[PDB]
Design a protein around this ligand. Structure first.
Ligand SMILES: CN1CCN(Cc2ccc(NCc3ccc(F)c(F)c3)cc2)CC1
Ligand SMILES: CN1CCN(Cc2ccc(NCc3ccc(F)c(F)c3)cc2)CC1
Lengths: 250, 282, 177, 56, 250, 282, 56
């Protein structure tokens, strides 16, 4: 059977007994930087195993009125194990990721989720011509809430769901790498995202490589059961991570 | 043919650990199903990355031959050189391995056994307390006699039965090394049985349990001719040491304390000790 | 435990906080009360030294319609045992998914500074801790029991071994039988 | 008629034995055998199961 | 000329323009653990470069009345860069060291120092039959003072210099690997210490692998100069470090 | 294969002395630099004229095997055959080599050791003084029992634990040669450690020093069944003799007198004795 | 299976040995080894120094 998948990174393992295939970015597997493409001179550091492992990033609660959530990487893993320490102590970094989003419910539940990784997901402010701090869009591993109605507070990003906070039709996000979690026939989605950027390496504190979005297209529904909500969990694992430019800790 | 030169047994070391790297596939060694009654054969190499390690450890000391190859006391008794009671001047012990707790528990981990036996006797003497103790006595001598089932049994220290003509016997003198002998496999069946879930009579009546199959005989001990002006007490200890052992059908070790020498009777016991709660680890 | 058989059942409930501990124990196979009287523990108590890896197998004995995920982690020796899932997930662990296969095996690797460890373990030769935590929680449909149970099995791998035969302390007598 | 064999010792040695009695029960313990097979108690199933493959 | 030495580990370099040879433990160079000698099953982690580099461990002041100092390893480097983090996060560790002790003075100064690494330098309490805490013998990178007179406080180790706090003649420490810093003809001492222990690996928080001692055999002296003291600096660098048994941070 | 014929080890004699004549050159063997931590390798032939000498001396007696290959007392204790105090009728000694000073100092010249052990027991008895001594007692017998860590421990002379079924034991009778046994290398680590600069708990707390690694077990001794009308006192001495020894990491010999059996505690001591002045040679 | 070897004696002689027990720990002391090497403690330097040449 092809409905069972097992992934082993570092000293952690993920087993899903009911899942689809594994989308693989734009058909490119993560890999180390080549000699003929690099620019920095000094020797890089490659702490595999220590950093290439799965890290569960907290958990959200899916209610009948949920609208969606997003996380921004790699800042989401800023304080997660040796990955965070290496990112703090180095000027440059580079790594792909494997994203696994779990969500299980009985045969009598119905709903559908969209899981998508949006590279360079620039967002606009709630009030045009008004700047916002770096706290209404990323504050560690905590998830951020979309809003059904138009946002009004000037200190946070425009959370209108149907525009995805990017000024584009939400239904067109299918262009990016993605998967669907349909409670009828699925329990998890796996995405392998290679390193996508305009330069060989970049600082991980100043640049958000890509954004993860979970949007319920078909709202959750059930009847006559003792379960009131469906927990959702997100797990990530850097792959082929290498750092460079050792400096004092930020 | 001055030397045979037995070939080496070839030290059997435990399994090594093979290097393993990251994996991502449909194989799921971790997942199994105990309902089949089959114990999983996974190894640490199948769930996390491991380095290559060469193990030189060996399981030599865990063999049944070595596990049971230790002498252990199985019986001790006292008898006096001179006294008013005739029955108190000699010992008569029906052979059985259920008297002493440790050796009993060790044996009871297997249903059937087949081995040779090595028997050693330790004998010591002491002068009984009294008002007058000044006496001179030469070294004492002791006799050990083995009586297979159905043979004549002595009734007093100076009985005619002590003139063994077919019954093996040992004469021992104090101050020397302990006596010893070897005994072959003397069971009527194909193996000794520690347990026997059955009766004696064909109508399911009579004696029940392992007491039915115990017909190994008796052992008698006495002072040869010592008869002191004042009492002298002696003690004998018997040690058994299996050799060339084979075992079958292992069973779980006993948990409840023993209470009878010829029965499995016991009192219910808690499974194990307790702790504050399921999370306490201190 | 008024009923002795309860000692073999690990409770599990439908509604629990997002991260909660299921159980925890010390890894002292020959000394800890948990492993003291198991089929493995009895053998070790006849010896003084032991080495090798161990297997812990967990079987979910809930309903067929129930589902859930559990995190089982082994923490090597340290100054303090883990208190929250974030601490536990740092060490060796496996994410267990409940489905058609009702059993999962956690292989405890042999990590030690010495080739052997004492059966009568102390601070010097500690072995660590094992804990289990809710990964997602248990969900059930209508018309099912609200509680379930789990059982644990212990056994030795193929590299396990013992040394120095010693008389067990569990059995004793005061008078000749 | 003497037997020569190695004696237990990591990777860093011979002893001679002669039997004096006519009964095999008198020989010394043969504690040099180390062959063992646990599949009898661990894999008593009828159909062999591959660890990699699913149990059912 | 053989009076000039240069050592390059990781991203750090040490250059001494006036030095002796380099003592090398008991003639054994540091190396990784072999497959046929290991005992732990899981894969080790080998973060070379990140951990194999020089770390300056504070500085002491050499006065005319100084008696000596000692440091204990690896606890001395407990909070020094990624080495400390790796040691915290792992149950088992293993690594050799390269110790470099600098001390420079003009041609008109006189003095002599003994630099020695003592493996398993067990010490006795000041008052017989009295225990002491793990603070009178190691508290991080700070150096500890020997005493000329017999120690009296019961809460600290016996600091009598002539006995070395070990019950042995101080003059017999030459048996251990060592070097002399003689101001006439030397400015630094270099020692390469392999991993010495009775087991393949051990925890670095519970066991002090070896102790470093600096003892002035000939007291410092000078006359008619504006310099009042001679600073002394110690630099260490782990070599072929590998860790194992990942666990939660201590 | 009736003879193996082990090849000769080839007596290794010390270095000879080569003839040397007058010299005048730029080579300066005498001058060196101890700052390197390197001991000079000069010889008398390099500083004065010497004749040719053949040395037949050998360093056989200085090998570690021979240096440590001598039996030495490590413990002695007394126990009475009969007395009111139960604890006074038997001995219970936790095994350790730190009790007796000479053997301790000999061992403490090396950090790590690995060897087999040969143990010998010397037992003697004497009648306690008293008003009435006239008695007659046969020869006495003694039992030595070894209890690995975690095993049951007897609480009285006639306890059930004395029925060893797995614990090795020796039964000995007075008037014969001393008892003896051989013990292999029984350390959990790769070598015995005389010193241990570390703690027990992972937070640097608890026991400190070599006391942490001492888990070798216990030894118990008793009179088998002797119980005299009048007290009799016995003494036992234990002797250890390493075999097949290997040593690592030598350390300077101790200078200060020992004061504790499980610690390195000491009192400051002068480096050495004094003399009248730096020139006195008488 | 007997071993024959020389016994210690200047320049002016065989003994036979047989092992009776099955454990190598029972053998007699092997005090006939005389190989030794002091360079480990006397010359632990990295660069070899010739005695004739100057130290520095
Ligand atoms: C029911 N079986 C009886 C045998 N028992 C083991 C056993 C077997 C033989 C013996 N002793 C045999 C023996 C040995 C030497 C003698 F001199 C003698 F009289 C008898 C002791 C215990 C297991 C239970
Ligand atoms: C911490 N180590 C403990 C061992 N000690 C040396 C040593 C090792 C073993 C022994 N005796 C072993 C032994 C030998 C024979 C026995 F019967 C028995 F019970 C124990 C004595 C001293 C050095 C310091």
């Amino acid at each position: 059977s092809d409905r069972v998948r097992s992934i082993t990174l570092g000293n952690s393992t993920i087993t899903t007994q009911e899942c689809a295939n594994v989308v693989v970015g734009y058909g490119r597997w993560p890999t180390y930087l080549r000699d003929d493409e690099a620019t920095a001179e000094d020797q890089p550091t490659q702490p595999d195993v220590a950093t290439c492992r799965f890290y569960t990033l907290d958990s959200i609660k899916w209610e009948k009125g949920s609208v969606g959530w997003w996380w921004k990487f790699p800042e989401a893993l800023s304080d997660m194990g040796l990955f965070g320490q290496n990112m703090q102590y180095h000027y440059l970094g580079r790594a792909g990721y494997t994203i696994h989003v779990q969500c299980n419910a009985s045969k009598f539940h119905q709903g559908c989720l969209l899981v998508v990784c949006v590279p360079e997901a620039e967002m606009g402010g709630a009030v045009v011509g008004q700047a916002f701090s770096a706290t209404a869009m990323a504050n560690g591993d905590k998830a951020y809430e979309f809003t059904s109605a138009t946002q009004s507070d000037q200190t946070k990003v425009q959370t209108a769901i149907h525009n995805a906070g990017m000024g584009v039709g939400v239904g067109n996000l299918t262009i990016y790498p993605h998967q669907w979690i349909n409670l009828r026939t699925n329990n998890s989605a796996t995405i392998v995202m290679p390193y996508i950027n305009s330069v060989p390496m970049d600082n991980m504190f100043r640049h958000y490589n890509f954004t993860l979005m979970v949007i319920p297209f078909v709202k959750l529904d059930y009847a006559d059961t003792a379960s009131t909500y469906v927990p959702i969990t997100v797990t990530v694992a850097p792959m082929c991570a290498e750092y460079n430019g050792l400096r004092l800790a930020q | 043919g001055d030397v045979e030169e037995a070939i080496e047994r070839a030290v059997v070391h435990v399994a090594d650990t093979m290097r393993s790297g990251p994996s991502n596939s449909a194989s799921v060694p971790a997942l199994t199903a105990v309902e089949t009654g089959h114990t999983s054969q996974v190894t640490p190499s199948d769930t996390m990355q491991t380095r290559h390690v060469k193990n030189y450890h060996s399981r030599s000391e865990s063999t049944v031959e070595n596990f049971l190859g230790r002498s252990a006391c199985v019986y001790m008794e006292e008898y006096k050189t001179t006294d008013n009671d005739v029955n108190k001047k000699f010992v008569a012990w029906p052979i059985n391995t259920k008297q002493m707790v440790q050796m009993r528990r060790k044996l009871e981990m297997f249903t059937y056994l087949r081995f040779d036996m090595e028997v050693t006797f330790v004998i010591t003497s002491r002068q009984d307390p009294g008002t007058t103790l000044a006496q001179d006595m030469p070294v004492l001598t002791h006799q050990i006699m083995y009586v297979p089932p159905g043979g004549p049994i002595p009734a007093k220290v100076d009985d005619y039965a002590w003139q063994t003509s077919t019954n093996p016997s040992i004469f021992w003198t104090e101050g020397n090394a302990p006596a010893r002998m070897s005994i072959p496999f003397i069971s009527i069946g194909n193996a000794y049985s520690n347990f026997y879930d059955g009766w004696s009579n064909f109508d399911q009546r009579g004696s029940y349990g392992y007491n039915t199959l115990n017909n190994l005989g008796h052992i008698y001990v006495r002072h040869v001719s010592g008869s002191s002006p004042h009492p002298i007490t002696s003690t004998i200890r018997v040690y058994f040491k299996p050799k060339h052992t084979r075992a079958w059908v292992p069973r779980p070790p006993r948990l409840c304390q023993y209470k009878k020498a010829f029965s499995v009777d016991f009192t219910p016991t808690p499974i194990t000790d307790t702790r504050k709660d399921i999370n306490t680890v201190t | 435990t008024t009923d002795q058989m309860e000692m073999f059942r690990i409770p599990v409930t439908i509604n629990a906080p997002l991260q909660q501990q299921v159980f925890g124990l010390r890894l002292q196979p020959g000394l800890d009360s948990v492993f003291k009287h198991t089929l493995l523990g009895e053998i070790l108590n006849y010896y003084a030294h032991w080495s090798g890896s161990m297997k812990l197998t967990f079987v979910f004995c809930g309903s067929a319609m129930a589902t859930g995920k559990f995190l089982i982690a082994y923490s090597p020796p340290g100054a303090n045992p883990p208190k929250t899932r974030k601490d536990a997930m740092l060490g060796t662990h496996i994410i267990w998914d409940i489905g058609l296969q009702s059993s999962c095996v956690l292989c405890v690797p042999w990590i030690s500074q010495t080739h052997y460890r004492l059966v009568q373990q102390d601070e010097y030769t500690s072995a660590g801790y094992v804990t289990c935590w809710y990964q997602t929680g248990m969900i059930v449909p209508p018309g099912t029991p609200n509680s379930s149970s789990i059982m644990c099995f212990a056994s030795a791998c193929n590299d396990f071994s013992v040394r120095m035969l010693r008389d067990t302390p569990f059995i004793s007598q005061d008078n000749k039988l | 008629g003497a037997q020569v064999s190695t004696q237990k010792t990591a990777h860093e040695i011979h002893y001679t034995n002669i039997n004096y009695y006519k009964d095999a029960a008198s020989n010394s313990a043969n504690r040099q055998d180390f062959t063992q097979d646990p599949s009898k108690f661990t894999e008593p199933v009828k159909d062999v199961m591959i660890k990699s493959l699913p149990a059912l």
